[PDB]
């Protein structure tokens, strides 16, 4: 879990996450090829704040061990221990968002339901730590193989206080608003229940197959008026959601699955299902058949 900079060998640039870039590297202490391939996260701007944030992600990630959560491996104190890099497992098939677009040939509803279940279970696990993810979306889930997805992107995750069921985030500025529960948009309140709302959007994403014009931003913007810019977008999204405006049932999506979506998208926070409810329902659906 302490990786030496001189043995971390660059292989590929991957995405460019919030703190900075992510690379695929080979860790080869024996210097001969033959090491483990890993993902290495870097911090672009190591300010007092960005570092504190990066360090918080590391603690969080180091504290989780679950089949459907990306593996923490360690840290690398490069530049003479004057820089730090997070070392994680490398999942070869990238984000669930890209996978669904690139590998339709090997995806059916059963696979979609498997992914759905796996995400729910990772989310049950986070809840036992009182962690709120706050950023659930297929772009933030990673694919190990055709049978296995893992939740990643713990850069925005927060811990609920001892006895507070919600966390108010001082000011969400430049947010993924189209995944957010109304009370997150209106009050900056995040909770297990707001994660459930977002999971609903994730379930929608799965069944739209990240198709051309059916993404949540595209759909919401169609409903609201594609003309709209800046804050009018937010104003109209809120008003829309408050009075039961919802994303449409994807083409070929079963009614039973759309109902799961609609139950997650309850304005009434308490009435949303739990992740435990959701895992059971999805697994039962799979097991019937
Ligand atoms: C963190 C990670 N582990 N394995 C990965 N495979 C990828 O294709 C992409 C990432 C990644 C995750 C977050 C931000 C950028 C890239 C990734």
mmCIF file of C-alpha atoms and ligand atoms in Angstrom:
data_model
loop_
_atom_site.group_PDB
_atom_site.id
_atom_site.type_symbol
_atom_site.label_atom_id
_atom_site.label_comp_id
_atom_site.label_asym_id
_atom_site.label_seq_id
_atom_site.Cartn_x
_atom_site.Cartn_y
_atom_site.Cartn_z
ATOM 1 C CA UNK A 1 0.000 0.000 0.000
ATOM 2 C CA UNK A 2 3.034 2.305 -0.261
ATOM 3 C CA UNK A 3 4.024 2.476 -3.926
ATOM 4 C CA UNK A 4 7.352 3.947 -5.036
ATOM 5 C CA UNK A 5 7.267 6.552 -7.829
ATOM 6 C CA UNK A 6 10.301 5.096 -9.654
ATOM 7 C CA UNK A 7 8.473 1.773 -10.227
ATOM 8 C CA UNK A 8 5.130 3.260 -11.426
ATOM 9 C CA UNK A 9 5.286 2.959 -15.208
ATOM 10 C CA UNK A 10 2.902 4.977 -17.412
ATOM 11 C CA UNK A 11 0.648 2.998 -19.799
ATOM 12 C CA UNK A 12 -2.300 5.213 -20.829
ATOM 13 C CA UNK A 13 -4.262 8.353 -19.993
ATOM 14 C CA UNK A 14 -7.748 7.471 -18.805
ATOM 15 C CA UNK A 15 -10.514 9.994 -17.949
ATOM 16 C CA UNK A 16 -9.883 13.391 -16.333
ATOM 17 C CA UNK A 17 -11.620 13.247 -12.929
ATOM 18 C CA UNK A 18 -12.469 16.215 -10.683
ATOM 19 C CA UNK A 19 -9.206 16.470 -8.701
ATOM 20 C CA UNK A 20 -7.195 15.876 -11.884
ATOM 21 C CA UNK A 21 -6.171 13.184 -14.346
ATOM 22 C CA UNK A 22 -6.243 9.397 -14.015
ATOM 23 C CA UNK A 23 -3.684 7.143 -15.695
ATOM 24 C CA UNK A 24 -3.297 3.424 -16.248
ATOM 25 C CA UNK A 25 0.100 2.359 -14.858
ATOM 26 C CA UNK A 26 2.073 -0.889 -14.284
ATOM 27 C CA UNK A 27 3.636 -1.238 -10.832
ATOM 28 C CA UNK A 28 6.841 -3.164 -11.413
ATOM 29 C CA UNK A 29 9.116 -3.261 -8.317
ATOM 30 C CA UNK A 30 11.155 -6.136 -9.881
ATOM 31 C CA UNK A 31 11.992 -3.817 -12.872
ATOM 32 C CA UNK A 32 11.439 -6.283 -15.772
ATOM 33 C CA UNK A 33 7.792 -5.757 -16.777
ATOM 34 C CA UNK A 34 5.558 -8.329 -14.949
ATOM 35 C CA UNK A 35 3.880 -6.051 -12.372
ATOM 36 C CA UNK A 36 0.248 -5.333 -11.487
ATOM 37 C CA UNK A 37 -1.682 -2.843 -13.678
ATOM 38 C CA UNK A 38 -3.281 -0.094 -11.581
ATOM 39 C CA UNK A 39 -5.157 3.203 -11.850
ATOM 40 C CA UNK A 40 -3.351 6.292 -10.614
ATOM 41 C CA UNK A 41 -5.193 9.469 -9.688
ATOM 42 C CA UNK A 42 -3.350 12.811 -9.649
ATOM 43 C CA UNK A 43 -4.243 16.195 -8.200
ATOM 44 C CA UNK A 44 -3.770 19.023 -10.759
ATOM 45 C CA UNK A 45 -3.835 21.978 -8.319
ATOM 46 C CA UNK A 46 -2.539 20.938 -4.864
ATOM 47 C CA UNK A 47 -3.970 23.869 -2.898
ATOM 48 C CA UNK A 48 -4.731 23.644 0.813
ATOM 49 C CA UNK A 49 -8.436 22.921 -0.066
ATOM 50 C CA UNK A 50 -7.925 20.505 -3.008
ATOM 51 C CA UNK A 51 -5.439 18.473 -0.970
ATOM 52 C CA UNK A 52 -7.763 18.275 2.075
ATOM 53 C CA UNK A 53 -10.457 17.113 -0.338
ATOM 54 C CA UNK A 54 -8.135 14.567 -2.033
ATOM 55 C CA UNK A 55 -7.051 13.289 1.400
ATOM 56 C CA UNK A 56 -10.738 12.909 2.388
ATOM 57 C CA UNK A 57 -11.395 10.771 -0.709
ATOM 58 C CA UNK A 58 -8.412 8.564 0.200
ATOM 59 C CA UNK A 59 -9.708 7.982 3.777
ATOM 60 C CA UNK A 60 -13.200 7.206 2.494
ATOM 61 C CA UNK A 61 -11.927 4.843 -0.233
ATOM 62 C CA UNK A 62 -9.499 3.135 2.140
ATOM 63 C CA UNK A 63 -12.416 2.480 4.565
ATOM 64 C CA UNK A 64 -14.572 0.525 2.047
ATOM 65 C CA UNK A 65 -14.182 -3.153 1.088
ATOM 66 C CA UNK A 66 -17.076 -4.511 -1.041
ATOM 67 C CA UNK A 67 -17.346 -6.453 -4.337
ATOM 68 C CA UNK A 68 -19.160 -3.549 -6.051
ATOM 69 C CA UNK A 69 -16.886 -0.693 -4.874
ATOM 70 C CA UNK A 70 -13.618 0.131 -6.716
ATOM 71 C CA UNK A 71 -10.582 -1.243 -4.795
ATOM 72 C CA UNK A 72 -8.240 1.082 -2.891
ATOM 73 C CA UNK A 73 -4.634 -0.064 -3.297
ATOM 74 C CA UNK A 74 -2.493 2.606 -1.654
ATOM 75 C CA UNK A 75 -0.772 5.937 -2.169
ATOM 76 C CA UNK A 76 2.362 7.134 -3.913
ATOM 77 C CA UNK A 77 4.261 10.055 -2.406
ATOM 78 C CA UNK A 78 6.077 11.222 -5.542
ATOM 79 C CA UNK A 79 8.461 14.188 -6.043
ATOM 80 C CA UNK A 80 10.433 13.315 -2.890
ATOM 81 C CA UNK A 81 7.228 12.884 -0.859
ATOM 82 C CA UNK A 82 6.132 16.422 -1.860
ATOM 83 C CA UNK A 83 3.217 15.239 -4.019
ATOM 84 C CA UNK A 84 0.644 12.497 -3.504
ATOM 85 C CA UNK A 85 -1.143 10.144 -5.882
ATOM 86 C CA UNK A 86 -3.972 7.696 -5.182
ATOM 87 C CA UNK A 87 -3.489 4.117 -6.384
ATOM 88 C CA UNK A 88 -6.611 2.105 -7.221
ATOM 89 C CA UNK A 89 -7.705 -0.992 -9.090
ATOM 90 C CA UNK A 90 -7.861 -0.681 -12.889
ATOM 91 C CA UNK A 91 -11.228 -1.807 -14.385
ATOM 92 C CA UNK A 92 -10.590 -2.320 -18.142
ATOM 93 C CA UNK A 93 -14.034 -1.514 -19.549
ATOM 94 C CA UNK A 94 -14.173 2.094 -18.287
ATOM 95 C CA UNK A 95 -17.370 3.885 -17.217
ATOM 96 C CA UNK A 96 -20.733 2.131 -17.381
ATOM 97 C CA UNK A 97 -21.815 5.087 -19.555
ATOM 98 C CA UNK A 98 -19.125 4.349 -22.178
ATOM 99 C CA UNK A 99 -19.558 0.530 -21.902
ATOM 100 C CA UNK A 100 -23.321 0.707 -22.634
ATOM 101 C CA UNK A 101 -22.539 2.743 -25.779
ATOM 102 C CA UNK A 102 -19.502 0.699 -26.920
ATOM 103 C CA UNK A 103 -20.573 -2.861 -26.006
ATOM 104 C CA UNK A 104 -24.298 -3.116 -26.795
ATOM 105 C CA UNK A 105 -23.514 -6.434 -28.546
ATOM 106 C CA UNK A 106 -23.194 -8.133 -25.144
ATOM 107 C CA UNK A 107 -25.842 -6.278 -23.129
ATOM 108 C CA UNK A 108 -29.455 -7.389 -22.579
ATOM 109 C CA UNK A 109 -32.079 -6.614 -19.891
ATOM 110 C CA UNK A 110 -30.781 -9.426 -17.682
ATOM 111 C CA UNK A 111 -27.285 -7.860 -17.736
ATOM 112 C CA UNK A 112 -28.875 -4.432 -16.986
ATOM 113 C CA UNK A 113 -30.705 -5.888 -13.996
ATOM 114 C CA UNK A 114 -27.481 -7.523 -12.762
ATOM 115 C CA UNK A 115 -25.685 -4.126 -12.890
ATOM 116 C CA UNK A 116 -28.694 -2.516 -11.180
ATOM 117 C CA UNK A 117 -28.538 -5.036 -8.325
ATOM 118 C CA UNK A 118 -24.767 -4.685 -7.895
ATOM 119 C CA UNK A 119 -25.089 -0.865 -7.611
ATOM 120 C CA UNK A 120 -27.862 -1.215 -5.010
ATOM 121 C CA UNK A 121 -25.702 -3.560 -2.931
ATOM 122 C CA UNK A 122 -22.692 -1.213 -3.027
ATOM 123 C CA UNK A 123 -25.112 1.514 -1.950
ATOM 124 C CA UNK A 124 -26.458 -0.592 0.966
ATOM 125 C CA UNK A 125 -22.802 -1.038 2.000
ATOM 126 C CA UNK A 126 -22.098 2.747 1.875
ATOM 127 C CA UNK A 127 -25.147 3.318 4.079
ATOM 128 C CA UNK A 128 -23.706 1.175 6.847
ATOM 129 C CA UNK A 129 -20.847 3.774 6.956
ATOM 130 C CA UNK A 130 -23.394 6.638 6.736
ATOM 131 C CA UNK A 131 -21.728 7.775 3.537
ATOM 132 C CA UNK A 132 -23.734 9.809 1.014
ATOM 133 C CA UNK A 133 -22.261 9.402 -2.496
ATOM 134 C CA UNK A 134 -24.016 12.534 -3.962
ATOM 135 C CA UNK A 135 -22.780 11.756 -7.542
ATOM 136 C CA UNK A 136 -24.414 8.480 -8.726
ATOM 137 C CA UNK A 137 -24.582 8.368 -12.530
ATOM 138 C CA UNK A 138 -23.409 5.791 -15.072
ATOM 139 C CA UNK A 139 -20.369 8.002 -15.892
ATOM 140 C CA UNK A 140 -19.266 7.356 -12.250
ATOM 141 C CA UNK A 141 -19.749 3.599 -12.238
ATOM 142 C CA UNK A 142 -16.885 1.421 -13.608
ATOM 143 C CA UNK A 143 -17.002 -1.960 -15.418
ATOM 144 C CA UNK A 144 -14.627 -4.807 -14.509
ATOM 145 C CA UNK A 145 -16.243 -7.223 -16.981
ATOM 146 C CA UNK A 146 -19.594 -8.206 -18.524
ATOM 147 C CA UNK A 147 -20.701 -9.607 -15.118
ATOM 148 C CA UNK A 148 -19.386 -6.960 -12.707
ATOM 149 C CA UNK A 149 -19.680 -3.216 -12.053
ATOM 150 C CA UNK A 150 -18.296 -1.188 -9.143
ATOM 151 C CA UNK A 151 -19.265 2.251 -7.799
ATOM 152 C CA UNK A 152 -16.373 4.767 -8.036
ATOM 153 C CA UNK A 153 -16.038 8.545 -7.820
ATOM 154 C CA UNK A 154 -15.928 9.120 -4.023
ATOM 155 C CA UNK A 155 -14.619 12.677 -4.515
ATOM 156 C CA UNK A 156 -18.003 14.171 -3.525
ATOM 157 C CA UNK A 157 -18.940 11.646 -0.821
ATOM 158 C CA UNK A 158 -19.849 12.990 2.644
ATOM 159 C CA UNK A 159 -20.380 11.385 6.072
ATOM 160 C CA UNK A 160 -23.687 12.009 7.870
ATOM 161 C CA UNK A 161 -23.223 13.424 11.425
ATOM 162 C CA UNK A 162 -23.853 11.029 14.350
ATOM 163 C CA UNK A 163 -27.585 11.895 14.477
ATOM 164 C CA UNK A 164 -28.404 13.983 11.346
ATOM 165 C CA UNK A 165 -30.200 12.212 8.469
ATOM 166 C CA UNK A 166 -29.233 14.925 5.940
ATOM 167 C CA UNK A 167 -26.066 16.830 4.987
ATOM 168 C CA UNK A 168 -26.331 20.407 3.672
ATOM 169 C CA UNK A 169 -23.513 21.166 1.231
ATOM 170 C CA UNK A 170 -22.616 24.870 1.703
ATOM 171 C CA UNK A 171 -23.138 25.689 -2.021
ATOM 172 C CA UNK A 172 -23.395 23.148 -4.904
ATOM 173 C CA UNK A 173 -21.989 25.240 -7.795
ATOM 174 C CA UNK A 174 -21.610 23.479 -11.172
ATOM 175 C CA UNK A 175 -23.596 20.377 -10.158
ATOM 176 C CA UNK A 176 -25.107 17.521 -12.259
ATOM 177 C CA UNK A 177 -28.578 19.009 -11.622
ATOM 178 C CA UNK A 178 -30.374 16.438 -13.813
ATOM 179 C CA UNK A 179 -29.517 13.653 -11.317
ATOM 180 C CA UNK A 180 -30.474 15.627 -8.194
ATOM 181 C CA UNK A 181 -33.478 15.157 -5.950
ATOM 182 C CA UNK A 182 -35.708 18.270 -5.669
ATOM 183 C CA UNK A 183 -34.710 18.909 -2.047
ATOM 184 C CA UNK A 184 -31.049 18.837 -3.164
ATOM 185 C CA UNK A 185 -31.854 21.452 -5.859
ATOM 186 C CA UNK A 186 -34.029 23.607 -3.583
ATOM 187 C CA UNK A 187 -32.284 23.185 -0.196
ATOM 188 C CA UNK A 188 -28.855 21.618 -0.891
ATOM 189 C CA UNK A 189 -29.951 18.650 1.274
ATOM 190 C CA UNK A 190 -28.286 15.336 0.537
ATOM 191 C CA UNK A 191 -29.169 12.047 2.171
ATOM 192 C CA UNK A 192 -29.463 8.337 1.584
ATOM 193 C CA UNK A 193 -32.889 9.224 0.081
ATOM 194 C CA UNK A 194 -31.383 11.678 -2.422
ATOM 195 C CA UNK A 195 -28.920 8.913 -3.430
ATOM 196 C CA UNK A 196 -32.005 6.741 -4.093
ATOM 197 C CA UNK A 197 -33.459 9.489 -6.366
ATOM 198 C CA UNK A 198 -30.190 9.577 -8.311
ATOM 199 C CA UNK A 199 -30.125 5.778 -8.464
ATOM 200 C CA UNK A 200 -33.553 6.084 -10.163
ATOM 201 C CA UNK A 201 -31.888 8.242 -12.820
ATOM 202 C CA UNK A 202 -29.082 5.652 -13.105
ATOM 203 C CA UNK A 203 -31.770 2.960 -13.713
ATOM 204 C CA UNK A 204 -33.269 5.195 -16.437
ATOM 205 C CA UNK A 205 -29.792 5.597 -18.010
ATOM 206 C CA UNK A 206 -29.295 1.826 -18.077
ATOM 207 C CA UNK A 207 -32.549 1.269 -19.974
ATOM 208 C CA UNK A 208 -32.038 4.178 -22.418
ATOM 209 C CA UNK A 209 -28.783 2.441 -23.452
ATOM 210 C CA UNK A 210 -27.149 5.912 -23.460
ATOM 211 C CA UNK A 211 -28.987 6.378 -26.780
ATOM 212 C CA UNK A 212 -28.504 9.540 -28.890
ATOM 213 C CA UNK A 213 -31.151 11.945 -27.542
ATOM 214 C CA UNK A 214 -32.526 10.117 -24.470
ATOM 215 C CA UNK A 215 -29.905 11.049 -21.838
ATOM 216 C CA UNK A 216 -31.370 12.845 -18.751
ATOM 217 C CA UNK A 217 -29.913 16.284 -19.730
ATOM 218 C CA UNK A 218 -31.218 15.962 -23.316
ATOM 219 C CA UNK A 219 -34.667 14.794 -22.154
ATOM 220 C CA UNK A 220 -35.066 17.367 -19.402
ATOM 221 C CA UNK A 221 -33.948 20.152 -21.796
ATOM 222 C CA UNK A 222 -36.546 18.964 -24.383
ATOM 223 C CA UNK A 223 -39.304 19.133 -21.718
ATOM 224 C CA UNK A 224 -38.189 22.518 -20.293
ATOM 225 C CA UNK A 225 -37.427 24.146 -23.653
ATOM 226 C CA UNK A 226 -34.082 23.702 -25.452
ATOM 227 C CA UNK A 227 -33.908 27.496 -25.805
ATOM 228 C CA UNK A 228 -33.286 28.007 -22.066
ATOM 229 C CA UNK A 229 -29.897 29.045 -20.657
ATOM 230 C CA UNK A 230 -28.283 29.764 -17.317
ATOM 231 C CA UNK A 231 -30.473 29.931 -14.244
ATOM 232 C CA UNK A 232 -33.882 29.714 -16.142
ATOM 233 C CA UNK A 233 -32.927 26.024 -16.708
ATOM 234 C CA UNK A 234 -32.720 25.437 -12.949
ATOM 235 C CA UNK A 235 -35.856 27.465 -12.246
ATOM 236 C CA UNK A 236 -37.876 25.346 -14.768
ATOM 237 C CA UNK A 237 -36.350 21.976 -13.754
ATOM 238 C CA UNK A 238 -37.388 22.599 -10.143
ATOM 239 C CA UNK A 239 -40.931 23.673 -11.101
ATOM 240 C CA UNK A 240 -41.221 20.688 -13.457
ATOM 241 C CA UNK A 241 -40.154 18.140 -10.814
ATOM 242 C CA UNK A 242 -42.217 19.706 -8.044
ATOM 243 C CA UNK A 243 -45.450 19.109 -10.029
ATOM 244 C CA UNK A 244 -44.677 15.534 -11.166
ATOM 245 C CA UNK A 245 -42.803 16.158 -14.411
ATOM 246 C CA UNK A 246 -40.624 13.019 -14.874
ATOM 247 C CA UNK A 247 -38.356 11.393 -17.457
ATOM 248 C CA UNK A 248 -40.402 9.179 -19.861
ATOM 249 C CA UNK A 249 -40.331 5.377 -19.881
ATOM 250 C CA UNK A 250 -37.456 4.314 -22.230
ATOM 251 C CA UNK A 251 -38.334 2.384 -25.407
ATOM 252 C CA UNK A 252 -38.500 -1.312 -24.570
ATOM 253 C CA UNK A 253 -38.362 -0.702 -20.817
ATOM 254 C CA UNK A 254 -40.794 -3.017 -18.914
ATOM 255 C CA UNK A 255 -43.509 -1.303 -16.798
ATOM 256 C CA UNK A 256 -42.241 -3.061 -13.637
ATOM 257 C CA UNK A 257 -38.826 -1.462 -14.156
ATOM 258 C CA UNK A 258 -40.285 2.001 -14.938
ATOM 259 C CA UNK A 259 -42.326 1.734 -11.709
ATOM 260 C CA UNK A 260 -39.010 1.249 -9.792
ATOM 261 C CA UNK A 261 -37.793 4.487 -11.376
ATOM 262 C CA UNK A 262 -41.014 6.339 -10.453
ATOM 263 C CA UNK A 263 -40.909 5.070 -6.830
ATOM 264 C CA UNK A 264 -37.337 6.377 -6.476
ATOM 265 C CA UNK A 265 -38.533 9.741 -7.892
ATOM 266 C CA UNK A 266 -40.939 10.531 -5.049
ATOM 267 C CA UNK A 267 -40.973 14.202 -3.957
ATOM 268 C CA UNK A 268 -41.829 12.745 -0.551
ATOM 269 C CA UNK A 269 -38.360 11.872 0.823
ATOM 270 C CA UNK A 270 -39.624 9.237 3.353
ATOM 271 C CA UNK A 271 -41.680 7.380 0.735
ATOM 272 C CA UNK A 272 -38.693 6.526 -1.478
ATOM 273 C CA UNK A 273 -37.602 2.861 -1.141
ATOM 274 C CA UNK A 274 -34.397 1.842 0.634
ATOM 275 C CA UNK A 275 -31.463 0.312 -1.241
ATOM 276 C CA UNK A 276 -32.277 -2.925 0.613
ATOM 277 C CA UNK A 277 -35.887 -2.746 -0.747
ATOM 278 C CA UNK A 278 -34.428 -2.139 -4.213
ATOM 279 C CA UNK A 279 -31.863 -4.959 -4.223
ATOM 280 C CA UNK A 280 -34.514 -7.464 -3.075
ATOM 281 C CA UNK A 281 -37.071 -6.321 -5.685
ATOM 282 C CA UNK A 282 -34.521 -6.390 -8.534
ATOM 283 C CA UNK A 283 -33.106 -9.762 -7.517
ATOM 284 C CA UNK A 284 -36.616 -11.189 -7.215
ATOM 285 C CA UNK A 285 -37.419 -9.867 -10.686
ATOM 286 C CA UNK A 286 -34.274 -11.618 -12.010
ATOM 287 C CA UNK A 287 -35.040 -14.839 -10.117
ATOM 288 C CA UNK A 288 -38.569 -15.000 -11.421
ATOM 289 C CA UNK A 289 -38.138 -15.837 -15.147
HETATM 290 C C1 LIG B 1 -10.344 4.879 -11.263
HETATM 291 C C2 LIG B 1 -10.368 3.920 -12.459
HETATM 292 N N1 LIG B 1 -10.027 2.668 -12.235
HETATM 293 N N2 LIG B 1 -10.105 2.042 -13.395
HETATM 294 C C3 LIG B 1 -10.503 2.887 -14.314
HETATM 295 N N3 LIG B 1 -10.720 2.603 -15.653
HETATM 296 C C4 LIG B 1 -11.133 3.614 -16.489
HETATM 297 O O1 LIG B 1 -11.311 3.382 -17.685
HETATM 298 C C5 LIG B 1 -11.326 4.872 -15.940
HETATM 299 C C6 LIG B 1 -11.092 5.128 -14.576
HETATM 300 C C7 LIG B 1 -11.353 6.448 -14.165
HETATM 301 C C8 LIG B 1 -12.126 6.708 -13.034
HETATM 302 C C9 LIG B 1 -12.419 8.011 -12.635
HETATM 303 C C10 LIG B 1 -11.966 9.090 -13.380
HETATM 304 C C11 LIG B 1 -11.225 8.845 -14.531
HETATM 305 C C12 LIG B 1 -10.925 7.537 -14.925
HETATM 306 C C13 LIG B 1 -10.677 4.106 -13.767
#
